[PDB]
Write a protein that binds this ligand. Sequence first.
Ligand code: HEA
Ligand code: HEA
Ligand SMILES: CCCCC/C=C\C/C=C/C/C=C\C/C=C\CCCC(=O)O[C@H](COC(=O)CCCCCCCCCCCCCCCCC)COP(=O)(O)OCCN
Ligand SMILES: CCCCCC/C=C\CCCCCCCCCC(=O)O[C@H](COC(=O)CCCCCCCCCCCCCCC)COP(=O)(O)OC[C@@H](O)CO
Ligand SMILES: CCCCCC/C=C\CCCCCCCCCC(=O)O[C@H](COC(=O)CCCCCCCCCCCCCCC)COP(=O)(O)OC[C@@H](O)CO
Ligand SMILES: CCCCCCCCCCO[C@@H]1O[C@H](CO)[C@@H](O[C@H]2O[C@H](CO)[C@@H](O)[C@H](O)[C@H]2O)[C@H](O)[C@H]1O
Ligand SMILES: CCCCCCCCCCO[C@@H]1O[C@H](CO)[C@@H](O[C@H]2O[C@H](CO)[C@@H](O)[C@H](O)[C@H]2O)[C@H](O)[C@H]1O
Ligand SMILES: CCCCCCCCCCO[C@@H]1O[C@H](CO)[C@@H](O[C@H]2O[C@H](CO)[C@@H](O)[C@H](O)[C@H]2O)[C@H](O)[C@H]1O
Ligand SMILES: C[C@H](CCC(=O)O)[C@H]1CC[C@H]2[C@@H]3[C@H](O)C[C@@H]4C[C@H](O)CC[C@]4(C)[C@H]3C[C@H](O)[C@]12C
Ligand code: CUA
Ligand code: NA
Ligand SMILES: [Zn+2]
Lengths: 91, 258, 44, 75, 72, 227, 513, 40, 56
Amino acid sequence: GGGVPTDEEQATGLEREVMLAARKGQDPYNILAPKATSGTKEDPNLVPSITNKRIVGCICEEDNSTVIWFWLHKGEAQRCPSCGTHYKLVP
Amino acid sequence: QTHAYHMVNPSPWPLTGALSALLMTSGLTMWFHFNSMTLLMIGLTTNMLTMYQWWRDVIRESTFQGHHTPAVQKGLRYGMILFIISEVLFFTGFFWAFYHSSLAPTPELGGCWPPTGIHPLNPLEVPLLNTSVLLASGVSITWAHHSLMEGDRKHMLQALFITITLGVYFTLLQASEYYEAPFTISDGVYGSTFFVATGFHGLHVIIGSTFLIVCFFRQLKFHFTSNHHFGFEAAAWYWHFVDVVWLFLYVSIYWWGS
Amino acid sequence: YEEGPGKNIPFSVENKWRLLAMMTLFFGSGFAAPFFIVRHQLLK
Amino acid sequence: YQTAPFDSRFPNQNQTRNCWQNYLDFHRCEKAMTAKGGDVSVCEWYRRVYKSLCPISWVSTWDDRRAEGTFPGKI
Amino acid sequence: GARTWRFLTFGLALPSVALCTLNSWLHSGHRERPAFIPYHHLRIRTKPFSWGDGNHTFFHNPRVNPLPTGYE
Amino acid sequence: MAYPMQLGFQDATSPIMEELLHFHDHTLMIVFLISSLVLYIISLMLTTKLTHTSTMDAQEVETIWTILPAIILILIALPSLRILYMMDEINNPSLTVKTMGHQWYWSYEYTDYEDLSFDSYMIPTSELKPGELRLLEVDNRVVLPMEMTIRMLVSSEDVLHSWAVPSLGLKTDAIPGRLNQTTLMSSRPGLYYGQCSEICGSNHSFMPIVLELVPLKYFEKWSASML
Amino acid sequence: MFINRWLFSTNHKDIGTLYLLFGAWAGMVGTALSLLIRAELGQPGTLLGDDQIYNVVVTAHAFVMIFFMVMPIMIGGFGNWLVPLMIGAPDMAFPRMNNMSFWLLPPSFLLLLASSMVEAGAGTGWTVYPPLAGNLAHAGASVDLTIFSLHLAGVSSILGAINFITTIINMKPPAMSQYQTPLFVWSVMITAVLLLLSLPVLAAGITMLLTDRNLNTTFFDPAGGGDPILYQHLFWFFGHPEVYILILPGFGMISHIVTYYSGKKEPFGYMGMVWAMMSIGFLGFIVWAHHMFTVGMDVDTRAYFTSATMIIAIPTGVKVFSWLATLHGGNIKWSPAMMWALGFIFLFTVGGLTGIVLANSSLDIVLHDTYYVVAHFHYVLSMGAVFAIMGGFVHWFPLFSGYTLNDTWAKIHFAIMFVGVNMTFFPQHFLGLSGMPRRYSDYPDAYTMWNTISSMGSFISLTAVMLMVFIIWEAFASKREVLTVDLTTTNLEWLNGCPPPYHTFEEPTYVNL
Amino acid sequence: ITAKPAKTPTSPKEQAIGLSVTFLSFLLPAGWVLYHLDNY
Amino acid sequence: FENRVAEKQKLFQEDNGLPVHLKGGATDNILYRVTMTLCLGGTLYSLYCLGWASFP
Ligand code: HEA
Ligand code: HEA
Ligand SMILES: CCCCC/C=C\C/C=C/C/C=C\C/C=C\CCCC(=O)O[C@H](COC(=O)CCCCCCCCCCCCCCCCC)COP(=O)(O)OCCN
Ligand SMILES: CCCCCC/C=C\CCCCCCCCCC(=O)O[C@H](COC(=O)CCCCCCCCCCCCCCC)COP(=O)(O)OC[C@@H](O)CO
Ligand SMILES: CCCCCC/C=C\CCCCCCCCCC(=O)O[C@H](COC(=O)CCCCCCCCCCCCCCC)COP(=O)(O)OC[C@@H](O)CO
Ligand SMILES: CCCCCCCCCCO[C@@H]1O[C@H](CO)[C@@H](O[C@H]2O[C@H](CO)[C@@H](O)[C@H](O)[C@H]2O)[C@H](O)[C@H]1O
Ligand SMILES: CCCCCCCCCCO[C@@H]1O[C@H](CO)[C@@H](O[C@H]2O[C@H](CO)[C@@H](O)[C@H](O)[C@H]2O)[C@H](O)[C@H]1O
Ligand SMILES: CCCCCCCCCCO[C@@H]1O[C@H](CO)[C@@H](O[C@H]2O[C@H](CO)[C@@H](O)[C@H](O)[C@H]2O)[C@H](O)[C@H]1O
Ligand SMILES: C[C@H](CCC(=O)O)[C@H]1CC[C@H]2[C@@H]3[C@H](O)C[C@@H]4C[C@H](O)CC[C@]4(C)[C@H]3C[C@H](O)[C@]12C
Ligand code: CUA
Ligand code: NA
Ligand SMILES: [Zn+2]
């Protein structure tokens, strides 16, 4: 006894784009928290953007209540002004 | 946008809703004091038009346009939970009124509960039937839910139809008990607590039955998937809330208060 | 929609004297209302 | 008798039930005494206490309701 | 599963409704209305009702609901 | 009654009002000290060019900030609750008087022995006798025996009122269908004034209370003369 | 375009703007009402009429200041503008429902002004106690229009509370825990929980009053076995939480302003400040009967309500001391917003302490329904809630508008208001101790000096309100455009510029774990 | 905060006009009502 | 019945700039005009009713 559509058959618009991206392990709509690198100049945190700048929030140490916010610009890696952690924009 | 949230198209329904509230309140004032129903009937009409178009647009945005990502659905889940909590606290005020009056009956009542000259309904007659009906509807709506998750269109429809039929049965039984009751809303605090508490509950049963009927027609139109059906979950949560309020009324007003 | 200073508001700030008139009418009507309601109650 | 003494059944600021109970007790005792044709003077304590505690308008309203047949307490 | 909740719907829930419907059916029929007594805590009228002649409750039943002055 | 430029409580006429004055003195000292300490610490934080803007550890100091206030509240609660229970204590009154609130006057009933009742209305401003107080005098005062425990019972026959006599520490709400009890004991003869203390409509400002405290023998003859 | 933008909004900033305009207009109404009160009391005798016209003015004063000025400005205005920006969210969870929360308020306000125009008004007090508020002592439409006003404001705030709780729980960056959200965001979430739980109980109570008035119910009428004191319990079950609703967002704004103008990256003792606000919110539900110490409740009940009420001083003290510890070591900027916030810390403390005096049932016998209560609540509302609103307004006006205020004028405004509110309310302590009742149009002659001084104070506060309108005009008239804002690294709401674009965070913030 | 100089400077005379007009908009209507109370 | 959701998805995603409350076609405009006319007319009538009730 069937007759109920599935998300695979009937999901549309952004719901479907999220569904199809997650099957491929991709996160274009920023649903997941990114995992930090070591954050050195050699191994900077890689920050995707669809433009040439994005706001970073840096939780410098685990369980800090204070988030440090700054614009990251296309070009050379920038550093969190509190902890010095490196971030690089990947547009 | 590279987030998952819904930027809603500019909408007139918030304003029409706000104005329908002005027309219903000013309309009730005009009915209670100036002997006229005109404003009130305009407000009830605009309120129904607003609800229809607003929830229609929510279906357009979700089923037809795909804006209900998991993040959006999670927000609607919280919204409906919070709305149900607010309705619980509303009923809590009426239960407080009931216990206040009944635990310390004043001399005007004869210093007893039920008051002198009050002949309560037998809780083992229609009130017990109404209890069986709402509990039964809690079982059938659960059947409907599992049918939908298992992808069974025919059994979802049959279970949901049974659930609506029981909600209608309860409403007709309560209408008949209202008509047959030898006491009225003007029979002191007994009538006051009985009719206002059971009356708001009856209104919630009608609202919940309307929501289930909306889910029934959306199901007929294939709107729900086996995994995405928040309107059905929300109607089911609301329907359990209505059942649980009934169980508290039955125990408090009908049984303990008899 | 227009963005930026003086454009994210439902009133115009293009002319400071027209703005003074609009603000005068807006805050002035709020402040006046209770005096005129009291006058209304006293005149019944 | 000066006034109604402290009654441990009614120890709080709300004395409504104290007035009510003593009014009931007087009228129940009076009915029991008029019935067997006994003496209403055994009822005197209840009479003094309710007269001390109860507002005149309450007693007046209750007496009117006993005569009307609309008094809601059991006598 | 759906199968179990259907089993409960038809095997327990609707049989209960059927039995309570029987119970109510058997105890229906008009019981005899009590002597009218004009108790002041009942048939309250502080303001006329906004319908009818102002003196009838909304679901007034002439058989069992006396007015302030008694049964109609 | 209050006098011009008064800062504090009317002088105590009853032992419980005396107790409330001493309890208020103790509480006010605490309010003064905490208000003063906060203002002084604000002014201390704001009067140095020295800086320290790095993260500050909170937990040690939060012990002081919670314990010291907890101790201070206990030092208020102890005498507060001793007085609460002292007013509630069983006392054996010699006399019961009822007052009924009305729009806009008080009625009094003394029904221990005879049916004595009367209405008590404000003296209009234009009818004051020389030396009498605007908005405070009544035609018929509540005559009571001094140095005797009196049970006052308070109700209303219309809307809420509240029967208050500040110098005796008294305020009891007047609620229709309810009989509220308080006790009154005046250490002194004299005239003790109060004012309706629940919003009750057009003349809420204009239904005062005047107690007249006299020796028992005078109260008895007055009672007899008022039947 | 104009209708689509301002009547059909789904934008958190524009809706915040609508709330601030609405609240500003409401503040002018509430100010006029406050001056009529003080004009009546400014010399012995009768100015306007008897207690009915007077108490219509007093009642409307309270409803307007609470429901149309403070709640719309703090929650609807600052909450809608700042909450999404402070969590990097693109809007509220329910951007269309948000617009209905706003548009319910003009009609709510219209019903209150209708109450005052029909018959003789609702001269009930803002508590609307029966039987004075009943259909015998207040026959006709006035009280029903007041009830309906409260119903619409109730629905507005309930739907607003659902919106804020959902937004704050569901729409933060996925790496951001609740313990990485700013204190203002916490203050709004807790306020929203209080609204969600308290307003439905008010709705139930005023609905019972509506049915007693119009459908011959007797919830509050002893003739039917009802009890006027039941209404008081239902009202105050809402009413005590309501005062915490009025101050909590003010606490949140004070934390931000003190941190900012101390040159600090963070408030002292963040988790203590979260603990304190949650504690105050919880304790605020179990104390309501401190509004009922004279109604005749049992001694043990009075003992419980005394004790439970005093407990609130502990978490409140942690916040006051944490604000002082935030100032400690700061590079202090003596901005106008900092002046408001420092006035807040001191004057809120004084009103909180007179509240602890009132918490003592035995002393409350003599202080209840006197100007001592009026002094307590105007210290916490007219010098607490209002100082936090004025501080927040001057601090964030350049974010909202893209223009600067004249700081010298803003300091003048602060100085005048500071003198006027203290001159108004400090002497009311003396009137309370010495026994002057509440809701009086006239007083025994002994109370004349302090009533005279209080009324003179009210006129100074009027001068400050008039100057404030001029100061806002001068800012829009001059058009000084914002360039740089300091401390954006710990104040995300500023990082999109002044004003921010209509759409912010279309691309969300990057926050890693 | 830093800001640009005023795009449309408000001179002392212009400020006196704005302040005067603001104050009159509060004071004249209330003053008219209170002056006429006796007549009401 | 048959599943015609795909045909409603095409209609409501059509690139025509209409807001969702008008995107169904001419019937939406009619029901919008009826709603807003009753609301605005009703509100003007409520103001007339206040004017009337404001005097004895
Ligand atoms: C913003 C509004 C607001 C706030 C926050 C408060 C906060 C408090 N209020 Fe108040 N209150 C009102 C608004 C408010 N109130 C209103 C409007 C009324 C009248 C209602 C009506 O009848 O119309 C009223 C009435 C009212 C009454 C009833 C009085 C009566 O009618 O007889 C009482 C009784 O306890 C009370 C107490 C308190 C207390 C204990 C607090 C506490 O939350 C205060 C806590 C703060 C502090 C104590 C200061 C800071 C602490 C320290 C520096 C630490 C050290 C302190 C100690 C050791 C004591 N208030
Ligand atoms: C928020 C609440 C609040 C505020 C701010 C005030 C402010 C004032 N109040 Fe009142 N008042 C109450 C709430 C408030 N009040 C309540 C609840 C009662 C009890 C009612 C009852 O008994 O039923 C009361 C009662 C009351 C009485 C007692 C009446 C009586 O018992 O007979 C008096 C007497 O003087 C008084 C006076 C004033 C004065 C002179 C001010 C002045 O300080 C006001 C000065 C002006 C302002 C403070 C500006 C306000 C405007 C803004 C902040 C807009 C800002 C604009 C932008 C940000 C763009 N009020
Ligand atoms: C089968 C159950 C379904 C209920 C449907 C019945 C009627 C219409 C609306 C119902 C809404 C529910 C509650 C409102 C209050 C009262 C009605 C109680 C239920 C009822 O219907 O009670 C009847 C009385 O109705 C009366 O007065 C009727 C009065 C009609 C006008 C109601 C006034 C509206 C009140 C305003 C509501 C405010 C909402 C608050 C929102 C909260 C916002 C924060 C009982 O009849 P009776 O003849 O006295 O006794 C029987 C004797 N044979
Ligand atoms: C005679 C009585 C008159 C009184 C007036 C009230 C009368 C009737 C109201 C009945 C309520 C009907 C509500 C219909 C909602 C339909 C829209 C809907 O259900 O929308 C759903 C979202 O839920 C959502 O918004 C959830 C939205 C929930 C709202 C429900 C609220 C109950 C409302 C009560 C309102 C008044 C109560 C006050 C009483 C005092 C859409 O998402 P999905 O379902 O996942 O679909 C998408 C999938 O297809 C993708 O594959
Ligand atoms: C005396 C008479 C006074 C009565 C006054 C009546 C007042 C106003 C008239 C109301 C008109 C209602 C019109 C329909 C409103 C539907 C709201 C709704 O359903 O809101 C939803 C959110 O609330 C949610 O879910 C969960 C919440 C749904 C709430 C539905 C409406 C409730 C209105 C009454 C509530 C009273 C509370 C009773 C308890 C005291 C959707 O949010 P949107 O922002 O639209 O969309 C977001 C998009 O992503 C969707 O695709
Ligand atoms: C789309 C908008 C265009 C249409 C506008 C709406 C026109 C409606 C006008 C009719 O007015 C009505 O007239 C009735 C009688 O004149 C009233 O009943 C009243 O009088 C009845 C009998 O006369 C009583 O039975 C009722 O209790 C009582 O409310 C009724 O209330 C009132 O509404
Ligand atoms: C609480 C807020 C209010 C605080 C006090 C307000 C201060 C008063 C501002 C001036 O108000 C005006 O005063 C005039 C008198 O000075 C009035 O003219 C009246 O008196 C004039 C002189 O007798 C006549 O020429 C006019 O016709 C006559 O209307 C005029 O109407 C009124 O607007
Ligand atoms: C989209 C636009 C919105 C539509 C606005 C419609 C406005 C026109 C409504 C007609 O007005 C009516 O006038 C009747 C006068 O004939 C009133 O009758 C009522 O009042 C009468 C007055 O005598 C009484 O006979 C009765 O109470 C009753 O019939 C009734 O109150 C009122 O409705
Ligand atoms: C024939 C039709 C098919 C639905 C479909 O697959 O499109 C069936 C499936 C389930 C049926 C419904 C359910 O069986 C429950 C109801 C049973 C009643 O006997 C008729 C109405 C009733 C409400 C049915 C109407 C209709 O015949 C439905 C909707
Ligand atoms: Cu009687 Cu106030
Ligand atoms: Na006066
Ligand atoms: Zn960092």
